[PDB]
Nucleic acid binder design. Structure first.
Ligand SMILES: NC[C@@H]1O[C@H](O[C@H]2[C@@H](O)[C@H](O[C@@H]3[C@@H](O)[C@H](N)C[C@H](N)[C@H]3O[C@H]3O[C@H](CO)[C@@H](O)[C@H](O)[C@H]3N)O[C@@H]2CO)[C@H](N)[C@@H](O)[C@@H]1O
Ligand SMILES: NC[C@@H]1O[C@H](O[C@H]2[C@@H](O)[C@H](O[C@@H]3[C@@H](O)[C@H](N)C[C@H](N)[C@H]3O[C@H]3O[C@H](CO)[C@@H](O)[C@H](O)[C@H]3N)O[C@@H]2CO)[C@H](N)[C@@H](O)[C@@H]1O
Ligand SMILES: [K+]
Ligand SMILES: [K+]
Ligand SMILES: [K+]
Ligand SMILES: [K+]
Ligand SMILES: [K+]
Ligand SMILES: [K+]
Ligand SMILES: [K+]
Ligand SMILES: [K+]
Ligand SMILES: [K+]
Ligand SMILES: [K+]
Ligand SMILES: [K+]
Ligand SMILES: [K+]
Ligand SMILES: [K+]
Ligand SMILES: [Mg+2]
Ligand SMILES: [Mg+2]
Ligand SMILES: [Mg+2]
Ligand SMILES: [Mg+2]
Ligand SMILES: [Mg+2]
Ligand SMILES: [Mg+2]
Ligand SMILES: [Mg+2]
Ligand SMILES: [Mg+2]
Ligand SMILES: [Mg+2]
Ligand SMILES: [Mg+2]
Ligand SMILES: [Mg+2]
Ligand SMILES: [Mg+2]
Ligand SMILES: [Mg+2]
Ligand SMILES: [Mg+2]
Ligand SMILES: [Mg+2]
Ligand SMILES: [Mg+2]
Ligand SMILES: [Mg+2]
Ligand SMILES: [Mg+2]
Ligand SMILES: [Mg+2]
Ligand SMILES: [Mg+2]
Ligand SMILES: [Mg+2]
Ligand SMILES: [Mg+2]
Ligand SMILES: [Mg+2]
Ligand SMILES: [Mg+2]
Ligand SMILES: [Mg+2]
Ligand SMILES: [Mg+2]
Ligand SMILES: [Mg+2]
Ligand SMILES: [Mg+2]
Ligand SMILES: [Mg+2]
Ligand SMILES: [Mg+2]
Ligand SMILES: [Mg+2]
Ligand SMILES: [Mg+2]
Ligand SMILES: [Mg+2]
Ligand SMILES: [Mg+2]
Ligand SMILES: [Mg+2]
Ligand SMILES: [Mg+2]
Ligand SMILES: [Mg+2]
Ligand SMILES: [Mg+2]
Ligand SMILES: [Mg+2]
Ligand SMILES: [Mg+2]
Ligand SMILES: [Mg+2]
Ligand SMILES: [Mg+2]
Ligand SMILES: [Mg+2]
Ligand SMILES: [Mg+2]
Ligand SMILES: [Mg+2]
Ligand SMILES: [Mg+2]
Ligand SMILES: [Mg+2]
Ligand SMILES: [Mg+2]
Ligand SMILES: [Mg+2]
Ligand SMILES: [Mg+2]
Ligand SMILES: [Mg+2]
Ligand SMILES: [Mg+2]
Ligand SMILES: [Mg+2]
Ligand SMILES: [Mg+2]
Ligand SMILES: [Mg+2]
Ligand SMILES: [Mg+2]
Ligand SMILES: [Mg+2]
Ligand SMILES: [Mg+2]
Ligand SMILES: [Mg+2]
Ligand SMILES: [Mg+2]
Ligand SMILES: [Mg+2]
Ligand SMILES: [Mg+2]
Ligand SMILES: [Mg+2]
Ligand SMILES: [Mg+2]
Ligand SMILES: [Mg+2]
Ligand SMILES: [Mg+2]
Ligand SMILES: [Mg+2]
Ligand SMILES: [Mg+2]
Ligand SMILES: [Mg+2]
Ligand SMILES: [Mg+2]
Ligand SMILES: [Mg+2]
Ligand SMILES: [Mg+2]
Ligand SMILES: [Mg+2]
Ligand SMILES: [Mg+2]
Ligand SMILES: [Mg+2]
Ligand SMILES: [Mg+2]
Ligand SMILES: [Mg+2]
Ligand SMILES: [Mg+2]
Ligand SMILES: [Zn+2]
Lengths: 235, 138, 208, 150
RNA sequence: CCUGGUCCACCCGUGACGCUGAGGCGCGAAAGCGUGGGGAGCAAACCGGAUUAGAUACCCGGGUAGUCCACGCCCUAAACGAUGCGCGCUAGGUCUCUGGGUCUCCUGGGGGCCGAAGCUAACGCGUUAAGCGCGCCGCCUGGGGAGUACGGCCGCAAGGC
RNA sequence: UAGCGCCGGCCAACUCCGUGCCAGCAGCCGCGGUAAUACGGAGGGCGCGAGCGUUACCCGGAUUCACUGGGCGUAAAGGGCGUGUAGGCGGCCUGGGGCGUCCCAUGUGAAAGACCACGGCUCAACCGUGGGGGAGCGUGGGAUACGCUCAGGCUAGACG
């Protein structure tokens, strides 16, 4: 719950091209052929955003953390692993929200097969099955890892790049699920219900924002967990 | 040149509102101003004010919209859904007081130019005068 | 014209018990009691889903066949009600219920509307003291519908009006049983009618 | 709770090698006659599953209709594709004057007296969608003055 | 050599002098016509050789009008963006021709592509609108009969409107 | 005295026999070539009923000549292009007139018909009395926002 001048790397945006004109209000100026996010407006929206987050958190609502961006891929899997929050990491499967029942059937099969590799029945039936089911469990854990925690539709979602993840965003809006996101110059602000106007590229920015966010979560639900161990992922 | 200044203004407003512009400038005329007054009073715009673009007089019209919405397409509801020119150059529409229309059964307005001045349908019918039927808004 | 054919077959086609027979439609002989299915060879076969037109046509036929009125007079009555002020449906039913034959049935001088028609045509009925033999005569509020002084000694009227002792007459009608007279107090309210009919469907039928 | 009636059923067909292959579409309207309607188009290999599915879809898509004394608050004219619908309010006792499609839709929304006209393309599907959009665009004096507060 | 249009910069001059445009008048690819010239290559017609069941064609060898110039006619077309002209408004990105500027970039005129909103039956269009508007002109009203018949006008004719 | 038309869909009403792309039906889509709810007959059914069908003609539906209320890239439809005559249309400010436009008053708008109410023929059709309308035009007075016009001014269109 600090920020301010401690934001380093955030104000850096994408190039002169590649932008979305709708983002013009959140831009300070154009330096070196690069849009630079407005310093103050960032915190401006940050307040309201984190307020929504705090409310929703102390109410007990679950938040689905989402990004594939490979810059943010490692950060999410821990930051969301903190508290109780589910996450989508590898890729966003179409229908995870709208088709959610059907997708959940896969989670049922997941814990099903985990229960199979628990019991004595691993060695029953030929190696033909043992080689298959193993890889099935393999990919199921590859994808549905963070998604296994959702027993019901989320009360909000958190998105790293709303442009890249825009399907997730789309069905979030469809289902009236409030959208939180970290928006860059290349994204459409209107689709985001609570906006965090900063760099979606640099690992530093994502680390800062997401870490402080989860910090706010656990702070809302009490217990004040120790500083997040994502700081070693700066490589 | 502009063939119909008033139609042009109404159109400027329409186009501006559709992309949810903050405000829009229109070339200044006392007539346009007197229309914008009614428009403001009836609450279709936040208001207007006179400005100078380059060295020439303009009217900034500050538009007005609804709250952000839910689901797909969050874009707010328009306060001006419909604004349309009726009497045009080359066909002009004059109505008597008994012939004054009623827009959307009262939910809309129609702007008349009478000899008692620029009035709405309610206002004109109240002062009991007809005139040129300028446009309809709802 | 006014029909003159088998009646309880209509009881059957409309799928709802009508009383065109007066008594015996209260007996378990009505054939609507023992054969609720439509008349004819194909009566007992599964009925296909009726078109909207079918529904409206049938409903209006129900309304019309209740009062035993020709389509000409029915239509005329409807358009007349349509021109008038007030809700078209209710006014329609009111105008229908103001017919002299129907009033005679309502007051119980006759067991059935058809019998009432015969009683009117033969001058057994009087309105305000003068004989009126027209079944389509329109009663107005305040009028006194009585039985002909010369006809009061007829067996049928004995039976009918003796059966009317203790019985109640509709809220818009008054009945003096001993003097064998009655009064039409006002037009019937829609609520006053027990008719198994949706009038809006009739309005929609002629709306076509 | 929810009264439901279907507008049209139709059998479409695709072409596969050595044959025609049929698929059934169904248009279904659902409403409480309390001012809530819904409209949906199901598509299935056989008719009943199509009707059922259409019902489901319809309950999923709902429109809140602001009735005033059994009629509509104000006239609207809506274009869906080449289909046009004109709804205009009427005094009590008038009845629902419409074609099959908007009749059913309106009657399930709890409309008693209304005047309509179908213009342009009469295609049932598009007329239906048009009607729904029309009902969806209806505003009330309340709504209006809610908008113009400022 | 003669001559038309047009763009930018300066903000100098006049002071609404504007837009459209029935009829009129002019221009109007190719083919075609008249008079005179020219004629290399190409080439309708035509003369042959093949192919083929036939081949009044495709393929091959020739070849006249014509194609070329001047002057005068003809007035047609898939004469096409199958999109009348003018003005205002409505995200951007990118390639390019051509000016100006504090020359990474900004600004103006023109030619392309992808795309916001919006439009469209769809395909698609989308500041070069097929979007939102205003002015004025031309035109449409199921297919065949038929762009035919009759009449009129134009043309040397072919034929055109 | 009870008749007439219809029963494939549009459109309310279905079965048997006869017929075999014949005989025939048919408003449009169509039916009939051996098992026809479509032809012909029967039973049954639906609709009207002193009528019921057919033909012809007018308006409707037809937003299909689109003022209300349509279109022209590929469905029918942008003139091959320009120049420009008549005509249509006309940027900002002030003033005069009051032609268009609007308002008040008044005259006219015969009767019958149309609407409403009451009333006479037993009802109705038919008819009597009363009431209410009304577009347009004439006259008198008034208003001046817009359009028009005359006079003056401006430079954002246009031209130089
Ligand atoms: N025609 C004679 C006139 O009738 C007037 O009365 C007129 C109206 O009051 C009367 O209308 C009648 C009536 O039952 C009631 N007011 C309404 C009803 N729908 C009408 O009934 C009839 O009207 C006409 C034929 O008259 C036809 O349309 C049709 O037969 C029927 N609708 O019809 C009359 C015209 O036919 C006045 N008494 C007087 O001007 C004069 O006697
Ligand atoms: N396709 C016709 C084109 O019309 C243009 O002009 C057209 C439009 O500017 C003008 O607008 C008309 C309007 O007058 C009339 N009262 C109603 C009509 N719907 C409008 O049409 C307009 O609005 C609709 C949306 O409703 C659009 O779909 C359509 O594209 C647009 N032309 O109507 C004109 C005729 O359609 C060009 N001048 C002409 O060259 C061109 O052929
Ligand atoms: K539209
Ligand atoms: K819908
Ligand atoms: K020749
Ligand atoms: K340069
Ligand atoms: K599309
Ligand atoms: K293309
Ligand atoms: K020509
Ligand atoms: K024969
Ligand atoms: K057969
Ligand atoms: K037969
Ligand atoms: K006709
Ligand atoms: K052409
Ligand atoms: K009339
Ligand atoms: Mg318009
Ligand atoms: Mg007048
Ligand atoms: Mg009121
Ligand atoms: Mg009204
Ligand atoms: Mg009426
Ligand atoms: Mg009525
Ligand atoms: Mg009618
Ligand atoms: Mg295949
Ligand atoms: Mg509502
Ligand atoms: Mg259209
Ligand atoms: Mg009232
Ligand atoms: Mg059509
Ligand atoms: Mg100057
Ligand atoms: Mg000067
Ligand atoms: Mg010109
Ligand atoms: Mg010309
Ligand atoms: Mg030529
Ligand atoms: Mg030539
Ligand atoms: Mg020559
Ligand atoms: Mg020669
Ligand atoms: Mg040669
Ligand atoms: Mg050769
Ligand atoms: Mg040869
Ligand atoms: Mg051969
Ligand atoms: Mg020669
Ligand atoms: Mg071309
Ligand atoms: Mg082009
Ligand atoms: Mg071009
Ligand atoms: Mg163009
Ligand atoms: Mg032109
Ligand atoms: Mg020009
Ligand atoms: Mg350009
Ligand atoms: Mg070029
Ligand atoms: Mg494109
Ligand atoms: Mg779109
Ligand atoms: Mg597409
Ligand atoms: Mg061009
Ligand atoms: Mg344009
Ligand atoms: Mg032509
Ligand atoms: Mg042509
Ligand atoms: Mg023809
Ligand atoms: Mg032709
Ligand atoms: Mg020709
Ligand atoms: Mg001739
Ligand atoms: Mg000739
Ligand atoms: Mg000659
Ligand atoms: Mg020849
Ligand atoms: Mg049927
Ligand atoms: Mg026949
Ligand atoms: Mg015929
Ligand atoms: Mg047989
Ligand atoms: Mg046989
Ligand atoms: Mg038969
Ligand atoms: Mg038939
Ligand atoms: Mg029979
Ligand atoms: Mg008769
Ligand atoms: Mg006849
Ligand atoms: Mg006709
Ligand atoms: Mg009708
Ligand atoms: Mg018409
Ligand atoms: Mg019409
Ligand atoms: Mg026609
Ligand atoms: Mg029109
Ligand atoms: Mg058309
Ligand atoms: Mg074409
Ligand atoms: Mg052209
Ligand atoms: Mg032509
Ligand atoms: Mg002016
Ligand atoms: Mg003028
Ligand atoms: Mg005047
Ligand atoms: Mg009169
Ligand atoms: Mg009387
Ligand atoms: Mg008067
Ligand atoms: Mg005067
Ligand atoms: Mg004055
Ligand atoms: Mg003046
Ligand atoms: Mg001047
Ligand atoms: Mg210049
Ligand atoms: Zn019975």
């Amino acid at each position: 719950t600090v920020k301010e001048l401690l934001e380093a790397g955030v104000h850096f945006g994408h190039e002169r091209k590649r932008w979305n004109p709708k983002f013009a209000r959140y831009i300070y100026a154009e330096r070196n052929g690069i849009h630079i996010i407005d310093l103050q407006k960032t915190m401006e929206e940050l307040e309201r955003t984190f307020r929504f987050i705090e409310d929703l958190a102390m109410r007990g609502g679950t938040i689905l953390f989402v990004g594939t961006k490979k810059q943010a891929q490692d950060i999410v899997r821990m930051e969301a692993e903190r508290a109780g929050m589910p996450y989508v990491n590898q890729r966003w499967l179409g229908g995870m929200l709208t088709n959610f029942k059907t997708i959940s059937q896969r989670v049922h099969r997941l814990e099903e097969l985990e229960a199979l590799f628990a019991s004595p029945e691993i060695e029953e039936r030929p190696k033909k099955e043992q080689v298959r089911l193993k890889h099935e469990l393999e990919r199921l854990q590859k994808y549905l890892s963070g998604f296994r925690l959702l027993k019901r539709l989320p009360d909000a979602i958190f998105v790293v790049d709303p442009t890249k993840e825009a399907i997730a965003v789309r069905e979030a809006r469809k289902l009236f699920i409030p959208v939180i996101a970290l928006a860059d110059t290349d994204s459409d602000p209107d689709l985001v219900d609570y906006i965090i106007p900063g760099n979606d590229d640099a690992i530093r920015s994502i680390q800062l924002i997401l870490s402080r966010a989860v910090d706010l979560i656990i702070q809302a639900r009490g217990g004040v967990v120790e500083p997040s161990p994502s700081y070693a992922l700066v490589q | 040149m502009l063939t119909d200044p008033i139609a042009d203004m109404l159109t400027r407003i329409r186009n501006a509102t559709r992309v949810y512009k903050e405000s829009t400038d229109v070339p200044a005329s006392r007539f346009k101003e007197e229309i914008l007054r009614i428009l403001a009073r009836e609450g279709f715009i936040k208001g207007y004010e006179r400005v100078d673009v380059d060295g020439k007089p303009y009217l900034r019209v500050y538009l007005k919209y609804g709250p952000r919405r839910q689901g797909p397409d969050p874009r707010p509801e328009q306060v001006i859904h419909h604004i349309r020119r009726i009497s045009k150059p080359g066909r002009r529409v004059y109505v008597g007081v008994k012939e004054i229309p009623r827009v959307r059964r009262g939910l809309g307005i129609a702007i008349l130019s009478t000899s008692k001045g620029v009035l709405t349908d309610r206002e004109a019918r109240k002062l009991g005068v007809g005139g040129e039927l300028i446009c309809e808004v709802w | 014209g006014r029909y003159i054919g088998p009646v309880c077959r209509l009881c059957r086609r409309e799928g709802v018990k009508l009383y065109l027979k007066g008594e015996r439609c209260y007996s378990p002989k009505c054939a609507m009691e023992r054969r609720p299915y439509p008349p004819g060879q194909h009566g007992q076969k599964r009925a296909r889903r009726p078109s909207d037109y079918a529904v409206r046509l049938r409903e209006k036929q129900k309304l019309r066949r209740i009062y035993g009125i020709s389509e000409r007079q029915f239509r005329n009555l409807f358009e007349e009600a349509s021109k008038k002020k007030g809700v078209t449906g209710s006014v329609f039913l009111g105008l229908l219920e103001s017919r002299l034959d129907n009033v005679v049935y309502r007051l119980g001088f006759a067991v059935s509307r058809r019998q009432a028609r015969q009683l009117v045509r033969h001058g057994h009925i009087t309105v305000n003291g003068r004989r009126v033999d027209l079944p389509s005569y329109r009663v107005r509020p305040g009028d006194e519908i009585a039985v002909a002084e010369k006809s009061r000694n007829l067996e049928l009227i004995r039976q009918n009006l003796e059966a009317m002792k203790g019985r109640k007459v509709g809220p818009w009608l008054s009945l003096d049983v001993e003097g064998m007279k009655g009064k039409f107090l006002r037009l019937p309210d829609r609520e006053d009618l027990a008719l198994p009919v949706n009038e809006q469907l009739v309005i929609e039928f002629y709306s076509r | 709770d929810f009264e439901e009636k279907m507008i049209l059923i139709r059998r479409t067909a695709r072409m596969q090698a050595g044959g025609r292959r049929f698929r059934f579409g169904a248009l279904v309207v659902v409403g409480d006659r309390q001012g809530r309607v819904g409209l949906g188009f199901g598509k299935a290999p056989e008719v009943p599953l199509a009707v059922q599915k259409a019902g489901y879809y319809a309950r999923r898509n709902m429109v809140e209709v602001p009735l005033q004394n059994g009629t509509i608050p104000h006239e609207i004219e809506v274009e869906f594709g080449a289909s046009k619908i004109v709804l205009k309010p009427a005094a009590p006792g008038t009845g629902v004057i419409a074609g099959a499609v908007p009749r059913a839709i309106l009657e399930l929304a709890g409309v008693t007296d209304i005047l309509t006209k179908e213009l342009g393309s009469r295609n049932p599907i598009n007329i239906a969608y048009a009607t729904m959009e029309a009902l969806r665009q209806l505003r009330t004096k309340a709504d209006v003055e809610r908008l113009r507060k400022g």
